A paper describes a structure:
Bromodomains (BRDs) are protein interaction modules that specifically recognize ε-N-lysine acetylation motifs, a key event in the reading process of epigenetic marks. The 61 BRDs in the human genome cluster into eight families based on structure/sequence similarity. Despite large sequence variations, all BRD modules share a conserved fold that comprises a left-handed bundle of four α helices (αZ, αA, αB, αC), linked by loop regions of variable length (ZA and BC loops), which line the Kac binding site and determine binding specificity. The four helices form a deep cavity that is extended by the two loop regions (ZA and BC loops), creating a largely hydrophobic Kac binding pocket.
BRDs are evolutionarily conserved and present in diverse nuclear proteins comprising HATs (GCN5, PCAF), ATP-dependent chromatin-remodeling complexes (BAZ1B), helicases (SMARCA), methyltransferases (MLL, ASH1L), transcriptional coactivators (TRIM/TIF1, TAFs) transcriptional mediators (TAF1), nuclear-scaffolding proteins (PB1), and the BET family (Muller et al., 2011).
Author numbering: 2431 to 2556
The structure:
């Protein structure tokens, strides 16, 4: 098949997974991915951008998916996991935001495990 077609099929999968993370709610109906959605405004969180070198938020990922910016799942994985790592690096694995990010990763690995079959069928038309 044609690469842009492939990259669109993938994009659709990446958007579903990423929407699952953004929308993800605990039994308590509160959105765990909320802290991950927007990068703190530079002007009053100058200390953030000193601790994080390669900052990324879910809104940006969500935006780039729609473009076909992610041509492989590794590039996607890399971006999604960087947003989680940056969160733990800044708030601490033990903070309430790390307890959350931790749990969101599990969600991420399940949705990624489940998509894996479709992702292989696409990539393996090369």
């Amino acid at each position: 098949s044609m690469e842009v077609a492939r990259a669109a099929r993938l994009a659709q999968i990446f958007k579903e997974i990423c929407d699952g993370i953004i929308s993800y709610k605990d039994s308590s109906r509160q959105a765990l991915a909320a802290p991950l959605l927007n990068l703190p405004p530079k002007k009053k969180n100058a200390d953030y951008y000193e601790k994080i070198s390669d900052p990324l938020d879910l809104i940006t990922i969500e935006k780039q998916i729609l473009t076909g910016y992610y041509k492989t799942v590794e590039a996607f994985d890399a971006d999604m996991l960087k947003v989680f790592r940056n969160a733990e690096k800044y708030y601490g694995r033990k903070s309430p935001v790390g307890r959350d990010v931790c749990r969101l990763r599990k969600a991420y690995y399940n949705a990624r495990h489940e998509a894996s079959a479709q992702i292989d069928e696409i990539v393996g038309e090369t």
